[PDB]
Amino acid sequence: XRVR
Amino acid sequence: VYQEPTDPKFPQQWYLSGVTQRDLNVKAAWAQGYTGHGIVVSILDDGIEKNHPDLAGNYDPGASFDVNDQDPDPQPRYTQMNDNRHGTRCAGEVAAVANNGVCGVGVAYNARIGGVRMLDGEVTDAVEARSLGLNPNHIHIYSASWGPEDDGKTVDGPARLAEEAFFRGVSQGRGGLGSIFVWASGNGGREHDSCNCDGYTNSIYTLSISSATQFGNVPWYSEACSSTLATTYSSGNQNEKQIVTTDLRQKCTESHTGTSASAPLAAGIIALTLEANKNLTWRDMQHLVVQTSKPAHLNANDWATNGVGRKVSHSYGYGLLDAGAMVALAQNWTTVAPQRKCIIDILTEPKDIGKRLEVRKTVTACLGEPNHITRLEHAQARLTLSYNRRGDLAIHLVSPMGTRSTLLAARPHDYSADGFNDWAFMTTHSWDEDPSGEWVLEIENTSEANNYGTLTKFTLVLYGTASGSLVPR
Ligand SMILES: [Ca+2]
Ligand SMILES: [Ca+2]
Ligand SMILES: [Ca+2]
Ligand SMILES: [Cl-]
Ligand code: NA
Ligand code: NA
Ligand code: NA
Ligand code: NA
């Protein structure tokens, strides 16, 4: 996997 | 009578107000008396600087938790690279304090703001679920500027606990009215990503928000898809202004950017709307967004008019949010009827895809049954198919009212041979249309390669009601  | 904020960077918040007409019309909502008082927003991200000079006055520990370290305090972890500044920037967009001589102001500068520290660690299904399901009878609106990797190859969505959190949220959250989940549609523009390959944005339970540059263009990072609902301003090229917000280490930044900045602005506008009518359901809120959002002055090559006369783009949804129009319409809003769900299994036999497959089916949309739908909300084409190179596929769905939704555009980096396993491609573009009649699904190979595969299941899932239509636009 999860990214900003 | 209304006095706009005097904060030092408020004149730089071009997206909140200006005479230029390129703004979100937020001052008009402030002047109607709506600044967010009583509404609670939580930023699901890498933490929130709860002592920031421009957040302390609005900070709400009841809207906050640290899921990464399992404690109540969502304070960011400070590093040399300032990696964990992201949540604090998002929080200031929603609810930075007004008229305090610091930085700028939030959209809902009198709302209460919290943060869930959940990105600074391994982001498991359970982590997402505990974040999405945090204090659901205290938090009104959840904002998420994160999601699956934007490499243009991934197909990924909420696993079981997270999907259960969404369903529990919209069903029992906020007194049964339903949690409002606001999602950033993604940053995969350079990778030719599609936000329909992202189950968080593609969900009917989230309001997926895209971005427009100051000059009204589709930013480099933008992802096109049919599940997007609306747009707010964000960054663009270096001649266009950016987003002004609170930064890590008690600072102010004028250079917050990307899809990440659009969701918080939407969450703030939704906070103002909830102040204007606390009785709005989660579906009410999506209806208000559809009816009030503004295409004008947004440039795109794919604007189309749907069956009820509304312009819709895969880059922008129904267009720019309009805070003044949202709060005005919300005040005397009549609650929509309970949501109906009509499940239509389309195929009688598997179909080889080849170079092109067109599947036509005339449907009655549960005519004569309690789930009869004459007013569509979301529509899903839940597809199961095999294919040798997934990113060569383009998928389109045409409604009986003639509205052509791109469910999937070509993704050059998607080499996967895994196909789609009951993937629920969603479109908002046929909202308020009558779904009775001929639907058309088109699957095509966009490459010159001799590709091959089989469509084994196509479930058309329609959501909506059977009452209360407006005269088409
Ligand atoms: Ca902590
Ligand atoms: Ca301020
Ligand atoms: Ca994406
Ligand atoms: Cl459902
Ligand atoms: Na409910
Ligand atoms: Na969504
Ligand atoms: Na029809
Ligand atoms: Na036709």
Chain A nearest CA to B259, separation (Å): 10
- How many angstroms does the Cα of residue B12 sit away from the middle of ligand 2? 12
> Has B73 been labeled as part of a binding site?
yes
Which backbone phi and psi does B243 adopt, to 5 degrees? -100, 135
B262 is in an annotated binding site: no
SS3 per-residue string spanning chain B: CCCCCCCCCHHHCCCCCCCCCCCCCHHHHHHCCCCCCCCEEEEEEECCCCCCCCCHHHECHHHCEECCCCECCCCCCCCCCCHHHHHHHHHHHHHCCCCCCCCCCCCCCCCEEEEEECCCCCCCHHHHHHHHCCCCCCCCEEEECCECCCCCCCCECCCHHHHHHHHHHHHHCHHHCCCEEEEECCCCHHHCCEHHHECCCCCCCEEEEEEECCCCCCCCCCCECCCCCEEEECCCCCCCCCEEEEECCCEEEEEECCHHHHHHHHHHHHHHHHHHCCCCCHHHHHHHHHHHCECCCCCCCCCEECCCCCEEECCCECCECCHHHHHHHHHCCCCCCCCEEEEEECCCCCEECCCEEEEEEEECCCCCCCCCCCEEEEEEEEEEEEECCHHHEEEEEECCCCCEEEEECCCCCCCCCCCEEEEEEEECCCCCCCCCEEEEEEEEECCCCCCCEEEEEEEEEEEEECCCCCCCC
Q: Strand, helix or coil at A4?
A: coil
Residue B441 near residue B397 (C-beta atoms within 8 A):
yes
What are residue B292's phi and psi, to 5 degrees? -105, -10
Pick the CATH number of B334-465 from 3.40.1280.10, 2.60.120.260, 3.90.45.10, 2.40.50.140: 2.60.120.260
CA–CA dist B111, B264 (Å, integer): 13
Report the distance separating Cα B209 and Cα B200, nearest Å.
Answer: 12
Please report where in the chains the tokens 């479930």 appear, as a residue.
Answer: B459
* Residue pair B374/B434 in contact by the 8 Å Cβ criterion: yes
CB-based contact B427:B401 (threshold 8 Å): no
Please state, in angstroms and rounded to a whole number, the distance separating the CA atoms of residues B390 and B425: 14
Report CB contact under 8 Å: A2, B46.
no
Residues of A with CB under 8 A from a CB of B: 2-4
> Are B290 and B229 contacting, i.e. CB atoms less than 8 angstroms apart?
yes
Please, how many CA atoms are within 13 Å of residue B309, restricted to the half-sphere of its CB? Answer: 6
d(CA B351, CA B276): 50
Among the bound ligands, the one closest to the CA of B110: 2
Of B8, B39, B1, B4, the closest CA to residue B276 belongs to B39
Q: Which CATH class is domain B7-331?
A: alpha beta
Whether B252 contacts B49, CB under 8 Å = no
Only one residue has tokens 């997402």, namely B128
- Please list, in sequence order, all residues whose beta carbon lies within 8 angstroms of the beta carbon of residue B200, skipping any fewer than 6 positions away: B144, B147, B148, B157, B158, B183, B206
Max Cα separation, chain B? 68
Tokens 């947004």 locate to B298
Say how many residues make up chain B. Answer: 473
**Residues of B annotated as part of the active site:** 45, 86, 260
- Is residue B198 marked as binding? yes
- State how far the Cα of B201 lies from the Cα of B276, in Å rounded to an integer: 26
Experimental resolution (Å):
1.9
DSSP conformation class of A3: B
* Closest residue by Cα to residue B42 from B60, B66, B67: B60
Return the exposure string of B345-375: e unless at least 16 CB atoms fall within 10 Å of the residue's CB, then b.
ebeeeebebeeebebebebebbeeeeebbbb
Nearest-angstrom CA–CA distance, B406 and B427: 8
Distant-in-sequence, close-in-space partners of B13: CB < 8 Å, separation ≥ 6: B104, B105, B244
Whole-number CA gyration radius for chain B:
21
For residue A2, give how far its alpha carbon lies from the nearest alpha carbon of chain B (Å).
5
Written as six digits, the tokens of B125 are: 């299904």
The residue extents of the domains of chain B are 7-331, 334-465
3-state secondary structure of A2: coil
Q: What angle do CA B432, B213, B108 make, to 5 degrees?
A: 70
